[PDB]
Design a protein around this nucleic acid. Sequence first.
DNA 1: TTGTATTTATTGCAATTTTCGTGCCAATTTCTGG
DNA 2: CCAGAAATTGGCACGAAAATTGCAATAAATACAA
Lengths: 96, 49, 96
Amino acid sequence: VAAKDLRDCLLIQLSQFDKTTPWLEEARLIISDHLDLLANHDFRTLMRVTRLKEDVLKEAVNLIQSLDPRPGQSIQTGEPEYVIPDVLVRKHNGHW
Amino acid sequence: GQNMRVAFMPWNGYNFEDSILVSERVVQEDRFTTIHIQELACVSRDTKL
Amino acid sequence: SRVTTQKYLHSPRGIFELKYFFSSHVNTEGGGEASSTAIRALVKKLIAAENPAKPLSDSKLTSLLSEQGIMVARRTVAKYRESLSIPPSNQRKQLV
DNA sequence: TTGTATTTATTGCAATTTTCGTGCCAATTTCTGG
DNA sequence: CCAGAAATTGGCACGAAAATTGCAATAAATACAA
């Protein structure tokens, strides 16, 4: 919460994980350095720059997508807003 | 109700002023176990969006 | 034009604005017209049922639409997709 | 019986502006074969 | 694997078509007094 942007929020959430996580470092590298081209869905230049494989890059991407993008939505407050219709159309005995 | 074997006597102050002393076998045999059923509702409405 | 302004109609499907029922059209095959709302629904359905490995581009979507009879141009399909807030083909692919 | 004042009925035209589909084309994205 | 091409995407334009908006004081039916 109270994060400046998405990269800061993801780094904050990733800094609470223990070092025993299998793919923590790769996800941290991707989030810190190359996030714009991850949003661009490159998945190929990301391989070149990060020097990873498909079976590892996919795991890092899944770990990133397992994070929470909006921390402040845990406490949801509000109400949906409705309208009063002006005319009603229904089905009576086989017609409208 | 249920048929209970009962004795009328004071027992160490545990039936003081209308208190009741119950055996553990009564609980083990589920003689006064009851089922309670509760209903919960979820309503899906139509909004502007 | 004046009557149908900001007045809502309630139907078993939902609440509409009574001007949601006025739309443009494109030529179909043989003869007739196809509404833009129907074409938008068809585009959304076709995109929602694509292969995640290779998303459908606008040319492929136009070719798929031009089997049911509709004659919609590539630029019009791109405009409909943008109106639906759907990213282009290269931004819908996934590593799976 | 007839000219006259009162109460209804009138809810459209004609401008002007907005939106439409689709073509042209420069700038990106992917593919391929040497 | 490296150019070069082939493909994709979206900004701008065009003429038609559609939608919006400003009008400002009338005509006939009807009850009524001469």
